[PDB]
Each structure stands twice: as C-alpha cells, then as structure tokens.
C-alpha cells in the first residue's frame, strides 16, 4: 500500500522548500512519501511528457532510432543547446522541447490522445493545443501516477513495442556509477501556477529498482538544484544510495 | 581505412608506472585510429572475460538467456570471490564478471553454434579449441586490440549478424559508467590461466557529438597493477582532451 513518513518533510524544511518525494521499493510492492495528499495532486507534467511523447514517436516512426538526426529550425531560442542540430539522446538530456514540439505535431491529435489513453498517462487530456498541452493544457498527472507509468516502461508492459521501450530507458540515462544507475526526467513548469519542479525516475541497484517521484514548489529558477538534491537526501537517509 | 596514427607520448603513461602495454582508440567520426604502440596493438591475446560481451550476445540470440532480469541460480559451490556465490542476471552477471554463469551459457550454446557465430562476427581468430566451456581462458582463441575495436564498432551500429535486441540489451548490460560529460560502456579483463598474464579494458565513450571506441592491453605480472587498467586508458583520454 502506502504509508507516510512525515520525517522526509525536514528535507524540504531544511531547503526553506514545500514538496513531495514518492518512493516505490519494487520488491516489497511498498511506496513512501512525505505527503499523501500532494503525493496524488495532478500538476503539468511539462519536461517529462517527453518521456510518453518519446515512445509514441518512435512507436509510430517518427522517430527512426536514437542517431536520426532533428535539424535544428533555425529559430534562435533563449537556451543556446536547443540552437543545433540533435538526436534522442541529446534532445533528452538537453531538454529541447522544439524536437519534442515537431515530434508532437507529427504524431496528431487523434493518435496522441489515443496513446496517452493506452498509456493509462494521467488523466489522458489533451485539450489546448497539439504542440503545447503538456505545457499549458489540459493534461495532469500526480507524482503518484507518474510511478505507475514509469514502473510500466521498466517492465516493458506499455502497449508500444518493446523496442521503443528499451530505446527510451537508454535515452533516460542521467547517472551510472558502481553502486546505481539512475534513469530519470527533470521538469521545471512555469506556463500555469503553481510553477513546480520535477524529477521522475527509478534508482536501479543490484537486487531491487526504487522507483522516484518528486515535485515542489519552484517560485523561481534558483531553486532547481533541489529537485536532485533532496530527492537524493531521502534516498540517502534510506539507504538505497551511499 | 586510413593508415592509423601512432602517438609514442602515449608511452609516458605506460613507463611513469614501470608498466608495458598498449591502448588504441577510434574516432568515429574522423574514421581514424590512434595506438601508442603499433605492434603490441595488432598483437592477439586470450580474450578473457572481455569474451563476455560476445558470450552475452549469443547466448541471447539463441535464447539461452530470455531477458536481462532472467534468474540464474548460484549452483551452491563457494568461489573466492564473494560476488560470485548468489544468483545472478545477466546484468549483474556481466558488472562482477560471474565466470561460472558464462561457462553455463557456453555449455549451452555448444560448439557448433559457438564456432558458426564467432565465424559470423569476424571474432578475433575464430578458433575455439580446447573445452567448450574455457576455451577464451585456456584454450585457442586470441583476439587483439584493434580486432577488439572493428568488433566493438559492429556491435555500436548493431551490424552483427544477431538481433538488434540482443545487441541492445549486451550494450545496456556494458554500461559502467554515466555523467553529464560522458557514458562508457566496455568490459574489463584479466588473463591468469596462460602466460602472458594480461589486463585488459575494451569499450566506448560516448559523447554528445561523437564515440570513441578503445581497447587497451597491458602485462598484468602481479593483481596489484590492476587499476591501470582504466587509470591509463583515461589519462591517455584527458591527454587528447576526449573526456575533462
Ligand atoms: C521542462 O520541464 C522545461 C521546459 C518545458 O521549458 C525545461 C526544458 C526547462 C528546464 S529549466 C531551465 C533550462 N535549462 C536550465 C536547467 O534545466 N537546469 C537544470 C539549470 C534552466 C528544465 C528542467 O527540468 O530543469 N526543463
Ligand atoms: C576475466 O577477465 C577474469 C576471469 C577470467 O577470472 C575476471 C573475472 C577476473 C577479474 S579481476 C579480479 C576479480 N574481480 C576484480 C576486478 O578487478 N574486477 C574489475 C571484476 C579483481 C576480472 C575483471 O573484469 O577485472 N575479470
Ligand atoms: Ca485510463
Ligand atoms: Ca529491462
Ligand atoms: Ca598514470
Ligand atoms: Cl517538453
Ligand atoms: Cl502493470
Ligand atoms: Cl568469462
Ligand atoms: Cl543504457
């Protein structure tokens, strides 16, 4: 089930920060968090929409494989690595949400909200517009939700093909040292209130995965170093990571 | 393919450790290599358990092994290294390099289909002589630096005559280590059974604009030099500036 640990609520404490981490520990089929009721709280999921959004594309072929290269529009933008030429992995480690916009708008309303629907993603809205609604429309999704579709892809039970699914956890790679890698998303939505930060993922050790969900409050970009930062301070107080 | 370069101030990082080896690298992009000795790169050796990235593919291949997280149970005899005496998948198999549950998948794969896809990648030398379960510790089969190199290159483009899944799943299973700056994905080696007892390092560092592939080979006399193994492949690296 679900217990709370009140505890972890210093770590946002000590940060002078309000937010929530979710913890699954897969081989008890055991979640944690510090705040039930944020832990189920449905905010945009901004930034990590391109994880789904990158497994419809490659489902779909839009997306060949990781080297197919996405020419950059020749829009100058405010983020100067979003200004070149990339592929998956780097559109995913760079965030580059024009790749993610064009990959959208390939995909198509109709096929969009059918596969969001398969995904069982949120509340599976996509109302606003096809480029953007991850940003600024309808869709929501909980840190909660975020668990149960992310415990889905490690699994492969997402109903895209296996490929696709093992293309997209390559591209999550964010961290790998000897004691555990990690694949994960950040997120930073600031479009609707309240601006939060994210981070999605999963910690995987030896003998267990630890699946992670952590949003907060982010009134300004100063503060975007915490969304690792403190996830990995309850992961360290649990003894998952050194 | 282009004449390769040999870069002798690589030797510096062999001698300021009273060590002899070779490292070679391959830019992609460039489609150019570098050694620091051409000889010793062209030089085959036992492959050792560096022979575990072509004994994972196989295996997979031929549905040996199902999955990455398929259970192989420890067969109960204690081992010294500790690592090795606990079930294993093929991910922690490959992370403590679980010799006996690479023996199995060879048993299994057999010698007939062992000889036919080794021929199939071009693995080396393709001999395979000796026990069908220790025949890249003890028996005939000898692969070198570069041979590791046009190998691992096939492997990076998934161009070996296996699925792609296999090779994915083997790349996925190499992988040792990831930052913002750079993943490496390689295999490490040490040959203790004949001599020349050597320490190997095979793999690639990917960046966010190229691949650098690299194989290194180094005499490995005593286990206390073992660390050299990666500590000069990656001087050698922030020496060409390729990592920071
Ligand atoms: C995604 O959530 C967000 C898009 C919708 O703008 C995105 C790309 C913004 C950045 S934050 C900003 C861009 N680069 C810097 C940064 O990411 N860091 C970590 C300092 C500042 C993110 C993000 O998740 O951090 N995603
Ligand atoms: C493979 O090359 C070798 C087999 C054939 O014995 C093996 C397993 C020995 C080790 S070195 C030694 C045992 N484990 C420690 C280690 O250095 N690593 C990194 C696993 C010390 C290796 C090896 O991969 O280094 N391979
Ligand atoms: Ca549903
Ligand atoms: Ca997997
Ligand atoms: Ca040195
Ligand atoms: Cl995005
Ligand atoms: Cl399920
Ligand atoms: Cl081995
Ligand atoms: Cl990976």
Redesign the interface.
């Known amino acids: 089930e679900w217990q709370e640990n009140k505890s972890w609520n210093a770590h946002f404490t000590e940060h002078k920060s309000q937010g929530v981490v979710v913890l699954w520990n897969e081989n008890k089929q055991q979640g944690f968090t510090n705040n039930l009721k944020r832990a189920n709280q449905a905010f945009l999921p901004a930034s990590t929409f391109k994880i789904p959004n990158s497994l419809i594309a490659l489902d779909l072929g839009v997306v060949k494989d990781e080297h197919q290269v996405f020419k950059w529009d020749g829009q100058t933008r405010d983020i100067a690595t979003w200004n070149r030429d990339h592929n998956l992995?780097?559109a995913m480690?760079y965030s580059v949400v024009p790749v993610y916009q064009e990959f959208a708008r390939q995909i198509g309303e109709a096929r969009m909200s059918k596969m969001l629907h398969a995904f069982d993603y949120g509340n599976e809205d996509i109302s606003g517009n096809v480029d953007s609604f991850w940003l600024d429309g309808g869709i929501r999704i909980s840190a909660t939700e975020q668990i149960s579709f992310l415990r889905k892809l490690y699994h492969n039970k997402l109903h895209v093909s296996?490929?696709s699914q093992?293309?997209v956890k390559?591209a999550m790679?964010?961290?790998?040292?000897?004691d555990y890698?990690i694949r994960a998303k950040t997120g930073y939505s600031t479009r609707i209130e309240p601006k939060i930060g994210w981070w999605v993922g999963w910690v995987?050790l030896?003998?267990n995965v630890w699946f992670f969900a952590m949003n907060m409050d982010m009134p300004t970009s100063d503060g975007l170093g915490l969304r690792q930062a403190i996830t990995k301070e309850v992961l360290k107080q649990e003894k998952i990571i050194p």
């Open positions: 992995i780097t480690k296996e490929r093992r293309i390559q790679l964010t961290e790998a040292n000897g890698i995987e030896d003998d």
